Structure formats: C-alpha cells, structure tokens
Design an enzyme around this catalytic site. Structure first.
Site, PDB file in Angstrom:
ATOM      1  N   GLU A 101       4.108   2.476  -1.411  1.00 36.30           N
ATOM      2  CA  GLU A 101       4.174   2.372   0.052  1.00 36.30           C
ATOM      3  C   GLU A 101       4.121   3.824   0.501  1.00 36.30           C
ATOM      4  OE1 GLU A 101       7.430   0.125   2.148  1.00 36.30           O
ATOM      5  OE2 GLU A 101       6.161  -1.620   1.689  1.00 36.30           O
ATOM      6  N   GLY A 104      -0.730   0.673  -1.535  1.00 34.40           N
ATOM      7  CA  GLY A 104      -1.565   0.304  -2.678  1.00 34.40           C
ATOM      8  C   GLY A 104      -0.851  -0.574  -3.691  1.00 34.40           C
ATOM      9  N   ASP A 158      -9.624   6.449 -11.680  1.00 31.71           N
ATOM     10  CA  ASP A 158      -9.582   5.528 -10.516  1.00 31.71           C
ATOM     11  C   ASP A 158     -10.395   6.083  -9.352  1.00 31.71           C
ATOM     12  OD1 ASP A 158      -9.104   3.143  -9.200  1.00 31.71           O
ATOM     13  OD2 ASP A 158      -7.056   3.667  -8.599  1.00 31.71           O
TER      14      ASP A 158
END
Ligand SMILES: O=P(O)(O)O[C@H]1[C@H](OP(=O)(O)O)[C@@H](OP(=O)(O)O)[C@H](OP(=O)(O)O)[C@@H](OP(=O)(O)O)[C@H]1OP(=O)(O)O
Ligand SMILES: Nc1ncnc2c1ncn2[C@@H]1O[C@H](COP(=O)(O)OP(=O)(O)O)[C@@H](O)[C@H]1O
Ligand SMILES: Nc1ncnc2c1ncn2[C@@H]1O[C@H](COP(=O)(O)OP(=O)(O)O)[C@@H](O)[C@H]1O
Ligand SMILES: CCc1ccccc1-c1ccc(CN)cc1Cl
Ligand SMILES: CCc1ccccc1-c1ccc(CN)cc1Cl
Ligand SMILES: CCc1ccccc1-c1ccc(CN)cc1Cl
Ligand SMILES: [Mg+2]
Ligand SMILES: [Mg+2]
Ligand SMILES: [Mg+2]
Ligand SMILES: [Mg+2]
Ligand SMILES: [Mg+2]
Lengths: 324, 325
Positions: free
Chosen positions: B50, B46, B154
């Site tokens: 990692e 993202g 999010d």
C-alpha cells in the site's frame, strides 16, 4: 557591517534558473566503479585520497579522488560546480562520478594531469613563463567568475601544471561557492596564507575578488622567491603578516569603510606598521623575475579593499601580459 | 537435462565481489523514525504493498511511503539490499529511509516522490521522439543495474514512473529483483504475465539480465503499435501461444532444442503451428506516426526467443533508433 557586492558578474546567478545554482536539488548519477582499475597513490589532501587509475573500457589514464566522510551537501556542491564549469578554459574536467559498490564511498574521476613539482618549477621558470601561467590562471578565474562561481581555495597546490606540454589546470573545487549579491558567506575558507583580509577580519559579504587576493599572494611568492609570501602562524597572525607589508593605516581605513568590528584578539598583536615599497623585496636571487610592470600588477591585486582589486578581466589587460 | 546458460555481459560481477554486497540475508537493516513522516494520501496498491504520498515533516519535502504486506522477511531484506546497492544509479528510484510502525511493527520503505503522469493521458500525447527518449532513460537504468549484478525481473509500465513535465523517469518496484550468479537456477514465477520472457514460460530456470530486455521489448511494442498489452495471454500457458502467434513456432522449437528444454504437456493441445509474422503487419493509421524502419529493427532485436540472441542494454543504447536522443 556595511553591505558590498561584486563590481563584475554581480547578477549572473540571479538571472539563471534554480537548476543552475541550487546544488542541494541537483540529481547526481553515480557511475559504476568497475570501469576503473586503481594504479597508485598520487596525493592525499585534507578531505581525500587521490589515485592514478586506468579506465579499462578505453585504456585512458585518469585520476580518482576518493572523498573522505564529509557533509553530503559539500559533495553535491563540488559535483554541481564541476558539471557547470566542465569544458571551461583551464578548468579540470570531471570525467565521472563513482561509488565503491561494497563500501558506498563517493569518488570523483578526473582527467589526469602530469603535474610538474612545485619546488622544481620554482627554480626553472623564466620571467616569460610566469607571465604565461598567470595568464592561464586568469583565463580559468575570469571564466568561473563569469559563470557566477568563486573558487575560494586558489593556491599553488590547486594549480596543476604540465610544463612540457604547457598545460595548466585549476583543480580542487571542494570549497567553491555560487555568488549571490548580498549573501553572507562562511569566512572559514581558503588556506591560511592565501586568505583575503575580508576573511581574517570576519567580513562575510565577500565576492570573486577573494580569488584575486589569493592570486596576488601566488604572484608575489614567485617573483620574489619567497614562499609563502604572507607567512602567518595562525589566522590572527596572518592579518599581522599582511599589515607588516601593506601597513596598518590602510587596514583601519578598510575596516572603517565597511564598519567592520575587529576581534579583541587583534588588540595585543596588530601593532603599528608603515606601508612597505614593493621594490624592498627585490634581491639578486629574484631580480630576473621582477620588473616595473610586475610590481605595478602586484600592487593592483594585493589591496585590503576587495572592491579596489583588479577583476580577472582587468588583470588580463595589464601591461604585464603584453608579451603573452 | 536442460543445457546450461550464462549472461553474455556482467557475467561474473557478483562472483568477484565480497559476500557483504550480495548476501542480503546477513545485511543489517537499521530502522528510522516513522514520526518524521506524515501520510497525505493513497498513491497506489500493488500485489505486495500500500503506497502513500507523505510529507517529511523535518524538511517539508514530499516522499512516498511503501507499506509492505505480510511476506517472507528474506524478500524484504533482498529489496532493501538491492535498493541500497543501486542508490544513486541513473534513473533508479532513491530509497530515502526504512521505517517501522511502532505498534503493528509493519515495515515501510520511504522513497523520493515522483509526480507520475497518467499512463492513459500519456498514451495519446507521446510523440515518436518521446518514445525514443524514455526508452533510452530505461536503458540507462537497466545497463546500470545489470552492471551492478542485479536483474529487475518485473519490468513493465506500472513499474516505470514518468514525470513528463520534467522529462524525469524512475525505474521502481525492486521487490522481485535478484542478484545474478552464473549457473544459478531461479524461480520462473516472476514478472507480470504479459512481460514474461519465453524462458519463464517454458520453465527454463537458468535465465539472466536478458529477461529484462524481453520485458522492455514488450513495452516498446505496446507503445509504437498502440496495443496494450502486446502479448495478451489469459494464463501462463496461453502467454507463450500469444508470443508464438507473432514470432512463429519454428523459432520456438529451435530455442527449446538449443537448450534441451522439456516442453510441459499442457502445451500439447494449445500451441499449434504458426508462421513468423512480419513486424510491418502491426502498422496501422492510428500508430504509423510512431513506427519507423529503425523502431522495427530495434524491436526485432529484443523480441527473440533465444535470451542469448537479444541485445544487452549497452548494445541497445548504440542502436540507430537512438541517434536523435
Ligand atoms: O482493444 P481493441 O483494439 O479492440 O483490441 C483488443 C484486442 O483484440 P485484437 O487484438 O483482436 O484487436 C484484445 O484481444 P486479444 O488481444 O486478447 O486477442 C481484446 O482483449 P480480450 O481478449 O481480453 O477481449 C481487447 O478487449 P479489451 O480491450 O476489453 O481487453 C480488444 O478490445 P475490444 O474490447 O474492443 O475487443
Ligand atoms: N587531475 C589531477 N591530476 C593529477 N594530480 C591530481 C589531480 N587532481 C588532484 N591531484 C593531486 O591530488 C592532490 C589532492 O587533490 P585535491 O583535489 O586538491 O584534493 P583535496 O581537496 O583533498 O586538497 C593534488 O594536490 C594533486 O597533487
Ligand atoms: N516513488 C514513487 N513515486 C510515485 N508513485 C509511486 C512511487 N513508488 C510507487 N508508486 C506508486 O505505487 C504503486 C505501487 O508501487 P510498487 O513499488 O510497484 O509496489 P508493488 O510491489 O506492490 O507493486 C506504483 O505502481 C505507483 O503507482
Ligand atoms: C607559485 C605560484 C605561481 C605563480 C605564477 C606562476 C606559477 C605558479 C605556480 C608554481 C607552482 C605550482 C605547483 N603546482 C603552481 C603554480 Cl600556479
Ligand atoms: C500506519 C502507517 C505505517 C506503517 C508502517 C510503517 C510506518 C507507518 C507510519 C506510522 C505513523 C506515522 C505518523 N508519523 C507515519 C508512518 Cl509512515
Ligand atoms: C508503455 C511503455 C513505454 C514505452 C516507451 C516510453 C514510455 C512508456 C511508458 C508509458 C507509460 C508508463 C506509465 N507509468 C510508463 C512507461 Cl515506461
Ligand atoms: Mg587541494
Ligand atoms: Mg580536484
Ligand atoms: Mg509494482
Ligand atoms: Mg518501489
Ligand atoms: Mg514486489
């Protein structure tokens, strides 16, 4: 030692998926504590601080058992077992599982039972009352044994009784375990006075019948008004107390049948003892609670040989309970 | 200036808790042993990390290692504190450990592994019942984190892991999550474009948990209508125009007037005039098996400009859309 297995519900866990008995893999979902407001201290046992509380979302009275720092495995086992037995006859209901936000302390939330005092029950209970309660405990035991679970801590302090409403609840499932035929269990379970001969001679392949011994100790204490019945001052002494009533002949017969290695600490304390007749514990203060049926029932629970003891289901069919 | 606002639920949960709970800057992080983990393969990658599948070599259990990219130390502490606070919550990813690379000193978060079902392969097999079931599982996670005084900020399909075979759902990626403090002005540069609530796009800083409810509405609309993303903006300004093409501009002006919001001049030539569209207009032959009157009513109650007018996660759970779950 010679292998052994339960005479009833032997394979109930073998025939169920891993999800049922594999408590280590069980996913616990902790609720927010905020729904609960603590009111007062109720009790304080070996691994907890118990509080009376109010669920402020529904104004319902509850009990919050704040768990003391112990192996996470043990908390998961108690939670999984309580979830499996939830709704069973006379089994305490686990209502929620919460963690204190700031301190990250686990806590189990239960239905509240307005528990009548032990010493208070001891004096007021009639012959019929004792039979009725014993039957209520037997319902809880036959149920948890049928669900492939052994309580391993049956004793008066773990039996909540509301006399006014005639309600009985078997509590404290923190030592409870899933039964698997042939499995070797830790013998360091139960409370000293209620420990089965199997535990005291370090015979690890025990089963549900351990609970039937503990129940026998409770019945003997109530009918004879002697609490506890088998008053050991340590774990080795506990077996001597048992031998002073059941005799040493049947004790050697038991250890020979299972090829049990008796610890050398028993060498100088065990002695030689004859089997006593149950009628010898009858006195003026307890004769109103004793009967031929009570003594016959008691004799069938308090046996060295765990395989020779009544199962919870056979106990329910005994002439002692015809009036209930 | 802009009119003040506060959450309608769990408004003062952090106010009544000690600084130890929400003061993440002062939280003491204890780093574990990296050598307990052996990396197996790359799982994801993202904006901030990692992510690798790993084996915990002390118990032969699969885990996930999220190696964190160079970012403000404050942000790493915030994610660690929130994850520790929410650990054990329903459908919240479990943080298992926190480790550091002994040489590069790169931080890494270790999580429970979820065997995530491929979103494209999931997109066609999910039934009406499955959508209701998974939406309810996300709601359990949101009602829980909101009750713990945290906004996720999010919420999107990539941050929801689903192991469809075991019907297991986990809300992940708490890197943008924050503690809700009534009256606080937050950064609007959060969430991913398509899931950004109108409050973020009009630069209204005093937002709350209800931001998560808008993002959840975007996810529901994309699943029941088979249109991903549902509001397909090409930039942050255009994102609001995409919303206005559905909800209409009349309710948008009503929203900004209620909060006395100053609309950026970049909206002057692009916003236009748009009527409110009926939700029934997005129903087609390819998606009619996933749509129902209850689904449309539920959707209409999440996708509202006015963040205070949206259902809370708890009210959403009581909706007739969830009676079968
Ligand atoms: O996938 P489709 O069903 O064909 O529809 C979409 C959609 O178009 P419509 O809503 O008009 O059907 C997108 O357009 P917008 O939603 O952005 O208006 C468009 O996205 P782009 O604008 O980025 O092209 C996307 O294209 P893609 O799937 O490549 O992202 C396009 O699909 P088509 O590629 O078939 O037009
Ligand atoms: N449901 C309950 N209702 C009322 N009192 C309870 C309840 N559960 C526990 N208690 C009280 O708290 C005490 C300790 O609880 P328990 O579960 O036995 O914990 P421990 O494992 O520490 O012995 C009990 O002996 C009893 O007095
Ligand atoms: N617990 C997990 N189980 C399985 N895959 C995971 C897990 N956590 C993350 N992933 C994968 O790694 C990706 C990136 O993780 P994420 O936490 O969202 O980091 P970032 O903040 O950089 O987006 C996810 O989108 C997913 O594909
Ligand atoms: C003394 C053991 C016994 C035998 C038969 C009937 C009731 C009991 C009994 C008495 C008191 C208590 C206290 N919680 C609990 C119980 Cl279970
Ligand atoms: C180089 C990868 C990394 C980055 C950040 C933190 C830890 C690691 C890490 C290092 C070594 C090993 C091997 N036992 C395992 C891990 Cl997980
Ligand atoms: C598309 C959003 C949605 C709505 C309702 C049920 C499931 C989902 C959903 C689909 C795919 C993915 C990918 N990890 C994740 C999720 Cl949460
Ligand atoms: Mg106890
Ligand atoms: Mg208990
Ligand atoms: Mg992500
Ligand atoms: Mg994550
Ligand atoms: Mg992030």
């Amino acid at each position: 030692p010679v292998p052994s297995r339960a005479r009833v519900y032997t394979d109930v866990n073998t025939h169920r998926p891993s999800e049922y008995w594999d408590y280590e893999s069980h996913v616990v979902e902790w609720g927010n504590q905020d729904d609960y407001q603590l009111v007062r201290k109720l009790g304080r046992g070996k691994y907890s601080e118990v509080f009376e509380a109010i669920n402020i979302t529904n104004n319902e009275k509850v009990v919050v058992k704040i768990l003391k720092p112990v192996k996470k495995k043990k908390i998961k086992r108690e939670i999984k077992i309580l979830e499996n037995l939830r709704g069973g006859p006379n089994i305490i209901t686990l209502a929620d599982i919460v963690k204190d936000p700031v301190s990250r302390t686990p806590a189990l939330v239960f239905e509240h039972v307005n528990n009548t005092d032990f010493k208070q029950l001891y004096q007021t209970l009639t012959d019929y009352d004792i039979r009725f309660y014993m039957y209520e405990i037997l319902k809880a035991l036959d149920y948890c044994h049928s669900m492939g679970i052994m309580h391993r801590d049956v004793k008066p302090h773990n039996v909540m009784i509301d006399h006014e409403h005639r309600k009985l609840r078997l509590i404290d499932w923190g030592l409870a375990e899933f039964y698997h035929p042939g499995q070797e269990y830790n013998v360091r379970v139960a409370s000293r006075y209620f420990k089965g001969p199997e535990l005291l001679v370090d015979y690890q392949m025990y089963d549900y019948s351990l609970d039937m011994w503990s129940l026998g100790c409770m019945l003997a204490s109530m009918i004879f008004r002697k609490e506890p019945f088998f008053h050991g001052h340590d774990n080795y002494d506990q077996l001597v107390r048992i031998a002073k009533v059941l005799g040493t002949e049947d004790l050697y017969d038991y250890i020979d049948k299972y090829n049990i290695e008796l610890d050398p600490r028993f060498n100088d304390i065990l002695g030689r003892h004859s089997r006593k007749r149950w009628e010898r514990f009858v006195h003026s203060e307890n004769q109103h609670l004793v009967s031929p049926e009570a003594l016959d029932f008691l004799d069938k629970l308090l046996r060295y040989d765990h395989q020779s003891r009544l199962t919870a289901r056979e106990a329910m069919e005994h002439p002692y309970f015809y009036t209930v």
